[PDB]
Design an enzyme around this catalytic site. Structure first.
Site, mmCIF file in Angstrom:
data_model
loop_
_atom_site.group_PDB
_atom_site.id
_atom_site.type_symbol
_atom_site.label_atom_id
_atom_site.label_comp_id
_atom_site.label_asym_id
_atom_site.label_seq_id
_atom_site.Cartn_x
_atom_site.Cartn_y
_atom_site.Cartn_z
ATOM 1 N N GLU A 66 5.283 43.432 23.970
ATOM 2 C CA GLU A 66 5.393 44.857 23.979
ATOM 3 C C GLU A 66 5.376 45.325 22.553
ATOM 4 N N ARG A 67 4.822 46.537 22.300
ATOM 5 C CA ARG A 67 4.808 47.151 20.995
ATOM 6 C C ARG A 67 6.231 47.480 20.646
ATOM 7 N N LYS A 82 5.777 56.134 33.878
ATOM 8 C CA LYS A 82 5.907 54.734 34.179
ATOM 9 C C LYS A 82 7.301 54.272 33.932
#
Lengths: 499, 50, 187, 470, 83, 85, 468
Positions: free
Chosen positions: G182-183, G156
């Protein structure tokens, strides 16, 4: 003497100075004192009542400050002086907390005397950013062959131990702690994970078992048990992982490694729910507080593998989530699953089918995974992943007229499954993981009778130790299997199989 | 050893209830009056230091 | 907006009255009239304090207002506009409450402070004076502000003293010290 | 300060708010008595709403009340009477004898709220009760000082099981036991009182090794909540001041959760999940944590739990499920199979059931039982459409064995003579381990499947084989 | 207990101040608290039900709730415009 | 329904499908239970109906098997035949 | 001089009482000077009586009611410019890349009106995408929202990187990778990877500008990160003319964040607990993104469907905004094809015949029909046997496996990573390539001469090299 210790204690009381802000309780119901006073209160500041109860001030409202009592409601009563401690929630952090079972306040609940600590640090300290981290590259072996190979565990990374209720979830975790003894014994700070077990909502009976098992395996001397028992009130339960995290942060800040196991955030969730609903804060999905996502995310992002500028350190974490009817659909599971980076999914059916650890390989994933796998162990277990995958597919074919290929898969698969059984509370060194898996990979175990797999395992290990513990020592120290070692190992397995 | 530790806890609790008896004795005395003066002058010193 | 903001309804009334009469700079007049009407409520102890209870209409209420300005038309007039307002908003149970609240705001405007010396028993007048002096001497009373230090008898607090003013207290009492002492000997 | 008197202001239900007079401040969790034509109505102070207006929960039915009724404060938690003079008496929630043997001679009184012993104090050892009930003994042996839990749903012969349990375990063990009934039917009540008079445990002459605290569901929601708390303190007196091991029994603890849910609503708290109290966790926790083995006595609770609509995933049973040490699940399906005890073998679990605890032999025998049954359950779907002759040969023998094992679990109860006629077989622990082992080894796989049904140990099976043979 | 639009301190203060004719407010209003895409306006006493009102901020709204002493307009447009 | 079920000494569940099936009264025998049980029925009637419950339950189990269309041995069909009657 | 004192801090909802006739407007930005630098509160209500209700963008820890507040005067104004390229910027528009204060000319409010109906471009035009698969079976479009589906495990990140490279070649554009909730772990990886792939080259030039939103950031800042990113894009598009492509990470976390902020604001959540402002909040975000006359944003979004439910309201609202979907899959990656795009699941709504050209449409349709048939054929080809199925059928299988291989492209970005020289194929030549394969002019050339190649021209070379 009993007299002398008491005499020291009375002597240790003496005088005071101005109580900066008094309060008078307006109404106390449901552990939600609503106080008139405390004009200059800091958010979530620790406040001390007349009764000596401590509180936090989650709601700072336009004329009342809604203290939440850490204690029981019985002791607090209306109109009480509410002295302002004037220090936002902070807990002693330092090196002395190793081998000390402490509650959230930091008071030894095992009476191992006043905490030796190098700082008191706030429990609301915010995680290290994007650039203050450097990608995971350090394994943490758990001594569970399946965990180490099927879902390898790194450092600073987080993976769930999400599974069905009371499947001895704590047991799967506890095993990891035991294996850390081997690395711990060593002198290298690289080889030192200082584990912290965070017992949230866990009954005192459970904590007694925890304490004894840890003492029995001599684990206390790198263990900290932060204990928030069932009895302990909802503010303590809420702040219990936060408090624990701060302790971990000190180790992390020193650039060391450590593993903090939050067990279980499901009870943390319940505590936040209790607080919010009782404070009349907006409710939300599945009657869990509206900001429950925010709570879990704050905790779980503290865990970090630090950068080399920040002198690479870690705070490996392993949250435990208890699934209610195995519903990953449920709101608290869904949130946590999203936040975490990998999951290990223990499965009740497997437990019943005697597979212990009862980890369901399919529903276990690691998103860091093989990046922090021992090189030796990586080599000898790529095959293993594929074989088990096939075994799963060919599982239903176990009902007669079965293709030779399918039957080959079945023999290999059944033996592997039997091999991955382990007696819980006995961890297994990597230098002994590597041989067993090699055999299975080379399919020499396929020949061995299913019933005899257990006997075979221990025998192979003793045989290896007798036959060539030089090989084992090489495996341990080189950590990378040379062609000569892989050659020798195949031979050794063949020889062992022959006897 | 086990009984020795238990006995220590028991002694401490015996002396605890004896302390309650001494507290009642203290609140009997017109030390109850005289120490109010002690608190008063001490507070004068404290509040003047503010 | 004028100093000291008393949060809470009925003190929203007081705040309004206070600020309105501060901006009309007729606070002494207001205060004086408020004392007088408060007094005439108290001195109408039955049939005009025992009918501050709600039950009366708007129209019946209006006639209560007329009776109030009938008792003495020495009222400030801003407080007569306030009386009308209170009738229209159909509350007057908290009337003397609003008066008291205005009093706090007013005497804050004057600068006057109140303190407390809760004790188990009424202390020496020498103690009272010394503490009043001390508090005035200390930065605790900033000056340009006064101290009505009130000893109250609270037998519940056993002996001791607690000095109180400005939400800052010094509590040297025997009960509290005893509490800590009992606790330290539970260790 | 003025004499402690309160005036009722609002009876809105069980919640009755009182308006104590100025400067006397009642305290959270005090006990108020209001003199009433029917006794003294007890109101437990639960919130302060300021201005000397408290909000209290009723413990006796509320009717005819007149707003303004003088309320004395007896202060602190409800104070029961405790003693060994409470042995063999039925004690209602406020503490009055409902065994109608006149006044209970009070030695000491105790509050009904008490803080659970601290972790340092709490000392818990692993010791094993012997139940003599085969399914229980092998697959989830019970432990002294534990928090045994008789989880089951609607009509799982819950009472029948309890009657057997009291008959075996209670009589067998010494010390004291405390029989507490939380919010149960007066049909069930009348039977329990009668049955333990009959078994003579409640020996009307001589001491009774049990006390009774019967709270029935006719009592107000409030009374239902704090009947449990009341019972616990009776046990604490035994644990502490009498030092003896207590074999506490509470019934049914879902009624305790349920009761708490109701008074949460009445207390006006925002309803939590599936309408349960937001304080559910801490309340459950408070009860369970209080129940424990200390360095003094060893309180061994056996708690019945009713699982609404056989959904143990429902938050109220599920929350209780965690706190209990030695679970037993009785399942509807197994009941229908006619297996008495109706204990579901797969779902019954106890912490003590480990080789290092209950011994390697016990463990191995039980491991063989568990796997065999689990395989059998897995194969049932396959067997349903495809039939028996499409599985492996090994599996076909395993199914035959599983069927033999399955009906070996049907071990008659000694109290199901009354309900049916089947004579109970109290099969010894050492013997039970032996009896299961033999079957699994296939030493009695020549014996028909139906000869394992409704009989005890292996010895009984051999005799029953002869019975079928004839 | 309760709060009323007249209990709003700015409204309350004008009434006490004797003034009560309150400008052209009986056919114009001045906005009280605002946000949530609905505004609560004081005055507009001659408002017709479901009238179109124009806020001075370049937005128009339709009066929805004609309430005792307050009217709650609904803002046909971005919240930022009204204050 | 949940509240009442807990309160009551027995439940006599009916099933709508069985009404249509022509079982009138439409009592759904498996969902119907009496917790207090026999000691309130005629002694004679207790004797005759001794295994009646067991037979009906077996009929139910058998009936499920029968609808998966698996070949039914004669012993199973003894149950089935008894069950139908 | 507009200043006010904090008069509540109930949760992260901070009510500030401002002095008279100096009352912020709704959507103003307030800055409370703190030992945490500043805490930025955004006014989202006026509670009247010269008091407001605001939301927070930084942690609301240890606030004292009585803190001095300063009013910015309008929505947070974040720096914009080519200067701000290659800078990781937090929600409050301050460097978190720690390469020092961001040099910038002008700053612009984070809330911005969506372009007028007049500014709308009459009909969407294709946005060239180097990935051949994208340009055949589901073309991008300038203005459009093309929703990437399938998370990491498909490469991705490399795909996202590929797009960044491609736009720079394609137009000359820039990009801004905005990651919403987002992490922080993933963020570290992205920064490290992006540096490594030189897309961000701090020493050099950095195509992509980063706005990273960590999950630790409070829900309010989680909600506002996207709008901040959008402003940056709009500066490029409108005020530097450059066509840009603004990536968003999980748009699920946009929704999720929005839901929380609503609940915090005390607005009754709607069905399936999704904010009452659900339509409007997506509406503001997804109509600012559009085709202007000046330039055009195009946005690739990642949709983390909740519990693989497409009928959940958050997906439904998302799908309404989406114009095309690119459906990366791991199966495809397991067939060794990187691009990981699943051809039969990739679909575009701007695939429309008129829009893409009739010839192009027809070529695509044939390739789609071929693939659709190929899949169905492979089902029974495996069971029955290849030779046990028609001459016509194996002609199709033969044709298909070549197309399947032809899809593969060794990406320019991953020239470094794989070591294989990049391939960027122009739109005309994409059409041409499939036309030739459809006429089977290269249906002599073996299957693996098509593996990991570029255009038609390229596979002439590979045919020769395969022989050699």
């Amino acid at each position: 003497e009993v007299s002398s210790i008491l005499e020291e204690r009375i002597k240790g009381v003496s005088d005071e100075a101005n109580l900066n802000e008094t309060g008078r309780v307006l109404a106390v119901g449901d552990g939600i004192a609503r106080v008139f006073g405390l004009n200059n209160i800091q958010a979530e500041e620790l406040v001390e009542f007349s009764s000596g109860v401590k509180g936090m001030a989650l709601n700072l409202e336009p004329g009342q400050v809604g203290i939440v009592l850490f204690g029981s409601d019985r002791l607090v009563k209306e109109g009480e002086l509410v002295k302002r401690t004037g220090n936002i929630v902070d807990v002693p952090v330092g090196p002395g907390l190793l081998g000390r079972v402490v509650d959230a306040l930091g008071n030894p609940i095992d009476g191992k005397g006043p905490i030796d600590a190098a700082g008191r640090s706030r429990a609301q300290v915010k995680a290290p950013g994007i650039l203050p981290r450097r990608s995971v590259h350090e394994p943490v072996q758990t001594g569970l062959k399946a965990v180490d190979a099927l879902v390898p565990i790194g450092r600073g990374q987080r993976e769930l131990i999400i599974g069905d209720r009371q499947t001895g979830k704590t047991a799967v975790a506890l095993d990891t702690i035991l294996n850390q003894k081997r690395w711990n014994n060593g002198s290298d700070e690289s080889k030192k994970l200082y584990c912290v077990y965070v017992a949230v909502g866990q009954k005192r009976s459970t904590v007694a078992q925890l304490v004894q098992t840890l003492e029995q395996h001599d684990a206390m001397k790198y263990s900290i048990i932060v204990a928030a028992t069932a009895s302990e009130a909802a503010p303590l339960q809420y702040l219990a992982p936060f408090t624990a995290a701060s302790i971990g942060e000190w180790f992390r800040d020193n650039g060391k490694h450590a593993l903090i196991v939050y067990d279980d955030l499901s009870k943390q969730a319940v505590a936040y729910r209790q607080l919010s609903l009782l404070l009349r804060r907006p409710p939300g999905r599945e009657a869990y507080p509206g900001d429950v996502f925010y709570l879990h995310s704050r905790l779980l992002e503290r865990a970090a593998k630090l950068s080399e500028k920040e002198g690479s350190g870690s705070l490996t974490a392993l949250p435990v989530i208890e699934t209610q009817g195995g519903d990953v659909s449920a709101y608290i599971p869904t949130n946590v699953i999203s936040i975490t980076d990998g999951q290990i999914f223990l499965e009740a059916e497997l437990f019943y089918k005697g597979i212990r650890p009862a980890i369901n390989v399919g529903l276990s994933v690691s998103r860091v995974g093989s990046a922090a796998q021992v090189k030796a162990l990586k080599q000898v277990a790529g095959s293993l992943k594929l074989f088990l995958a096939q075994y799963r597919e060919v599982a239903a074919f176990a009902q007669s007229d079965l293709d030779a290929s399918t039957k080959q898969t079945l023999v290999r698969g059944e033996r592997l499954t039997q091999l991955l059984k382990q007696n819980q509370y006995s961890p297994l060194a990597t230098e002994e993981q590597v041989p067993l898996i090699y055999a299975g990979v080379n399919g020499h175990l396929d020949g061995i009778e299913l019933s005899r797999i257990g006997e075979f395992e221990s025998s192979f290990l003793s045989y290896l130790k007798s036959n060539h513990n030089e090989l084992l020592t090489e495996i341990r120290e080189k950590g990378e299997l040379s062609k000569e070692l892989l050659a020798s190992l195949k031979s050794a397995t063949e020889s062992f199989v022959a006897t | 050893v086990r009984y020795e530790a238990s006995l220590r806890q028991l002694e401490q609790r015996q002396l605890a209830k004896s302390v309650i008896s001494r507290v009642q004795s203290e609140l009997g005395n017109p030390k109850f009056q005289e120490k109010v003066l002690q608190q008063s002058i001490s507070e004068i010193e404290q509040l003047l230091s503010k | 907006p004028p100093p000291v903001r008393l949060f809470g309804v009925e003190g929203t009334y007081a705040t309004a009255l206070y600020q309105a009469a501060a901006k009309n700079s007729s606070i002494d007049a207001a205060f004086q009239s408020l004392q007088k009407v408060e007094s005439t409520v108290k001195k109408n102890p039955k049939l005009g304090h025992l009918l501050l209870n709600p039950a009366l209409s708007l129209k019946d209420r209006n006639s209560v207002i007329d009776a109030i300005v009938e008792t003495h038309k020495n009222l400030d007039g801003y407080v007569v506009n306030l009386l009308k307002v209170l009738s229209e908003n159909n509350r007057l149970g908290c009337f003397e409450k609003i008066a008291s609240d205005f009093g706090v705001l007013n005497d804050a405007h004057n600068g006057l402070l109140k303190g407390t010396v809760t004790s188990a028993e009424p202390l020496d007048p020498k103690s009272f004076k010394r503490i009043e002096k001390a508090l005035s001497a200390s930065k605790l009373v900033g000056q340009g502000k006064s101290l009505k230090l009130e000893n109250v008898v609270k037998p519940e607090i056993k002996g001791g003293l607690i000095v109180e003013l400005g939400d800052k207290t010094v509590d040297l009492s025997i009960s509290t010290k005893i509490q800590k002492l009992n606790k330290v000997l539970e260790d | 300060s003025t004499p402690i008197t309160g005036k009722v202001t609002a009876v809105i239900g069980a919640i009755v708010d009182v308006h104590f007079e100025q400067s006397e401040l009642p305290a959270i969790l005090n006990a108020l008595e209001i003199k009433t034509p029917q006794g003294k109505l007890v109101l437990e102070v639960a919130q302060h709403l300021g201005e000397n207006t408290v909000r209290t929960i009723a413990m006796d039915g509320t009717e005819g009340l007149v707003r303004g009724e003088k309320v004395l404060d007896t202060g602190g938690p409800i104070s029961v009477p405790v003693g060994r003079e409470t042995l063999g008496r039925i004690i209602n929630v406020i503490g009055e004898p409902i065994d109608e043997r006149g006044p209970i001679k009070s030695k000491l009184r105790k509050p009904i709220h008490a803080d659970p012993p601290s972790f340092a104090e709490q000392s818990t050892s692993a010791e094993i009760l012997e139940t003599g009930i085969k399914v229980v003994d092998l697959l989830a042996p019970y432990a002294r000082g534990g928090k045994i839990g008789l989880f089951g749903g609607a009509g799982v012969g819950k009472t029948v099981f309890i009657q057997e349990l009291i008959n075996n375990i209670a009589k067998a063990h010494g010390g004291f036991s405390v029989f507490t009934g939380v919010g149960e039917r007066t049909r069930e009540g009348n039977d329990l009182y009668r049955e333990m008079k009959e078994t003579g445990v409640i020996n009307l002459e001589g001491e009774s090794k049990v006390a009774l605290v019967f709270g029935q569901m006719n009592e107000p929601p409030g009374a239902r909540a704090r009947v449990a708390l009341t019972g616990l303190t009776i046990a604490e007196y035994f644990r502490d001041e009498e030092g003896q091991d207590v074999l506490l029994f509470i019934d049914n603890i879902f009624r305790f959760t349920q009761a708490g849910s109701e008074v949460s609503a009445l207390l006006g708290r925002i309803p939590s999940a599936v309408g349960y109290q937001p304080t559910l966790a801490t309340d459950m926790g408070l009860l369970q944590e209080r129940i424990t083995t200390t360095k003094k006595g060893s309180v061994t609770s056996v708690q019945a739990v009713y699982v609404p609509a056989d959904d143990l995933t429902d938050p109220a049973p599920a929350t209780t499920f965690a706190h209990l040490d030695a679970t037993t699940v009785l399942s509807r399906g197994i009941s229908e199979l006619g297996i008495y005890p109706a204990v579901d073998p797969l779902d019954s679990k106890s912490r003590l059931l480990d080789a290092a605890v209950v011994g390697q032999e016990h463990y191995d025998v039980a491991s063989k039982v568990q796997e065999t049954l689990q395989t059998y359950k897995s194969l049932q779907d396959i067997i349903a459409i495809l039939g028996m002759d499409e599985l492996s040969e090994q599996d076909k023998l395993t199914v035959e064995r599983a069927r033999k094992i399955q009906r070996f679990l049907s071990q008659p109860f000694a109290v199901a003579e009354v309900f049916t006629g089947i004579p109970g077989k109290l099969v010894r622990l050492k013997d039970t381990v032996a009896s299961f082992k033999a079957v699994l080894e296939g030493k009695y796989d020549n014996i028909p499947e139906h000869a394992f049904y409704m009989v005890g140990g292996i010895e009984d099976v051999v005799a029953k084989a002869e019975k079928l043979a004839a | 207990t309760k709060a009323q639009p007249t209990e709003v301190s700015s409204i309350l203060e004008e009434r006490i101040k004797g003034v009560s004719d309150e400008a052209n407010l009986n056919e114009t209003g001045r906005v009280l608290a605002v946000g949530d895409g609905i505004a609560r306006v004081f005055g507009l006493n001659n408002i017709q039900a479901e009238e179109l009102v124009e806020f001075s901020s370049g937005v128009k709204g339709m009066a929805l709730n004609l309430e005792p002493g307050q009217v709650g307009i609904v803002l046909f447009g971005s919240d930022r415009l009204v204050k | 329904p949940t509240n009442v079920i807990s309160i009551t000494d027995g439940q006599i569940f009916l099933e709508a499908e069985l009404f249509y099936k022509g079982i009138r009264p439409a009592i759904n025998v498996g969902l119907s239970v009496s917790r207090v049980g026999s000691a309130a029925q005629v002694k004679a009637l207790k004797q005759v109906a001794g295994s009646l419950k067991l037979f009906l339950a077996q009929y139910r189990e058998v009936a499920a098997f029968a609808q998966f269309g698996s070949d039914l041995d004669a012993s199973t069909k003894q149950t089935l035949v008894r069950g139908e009657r």
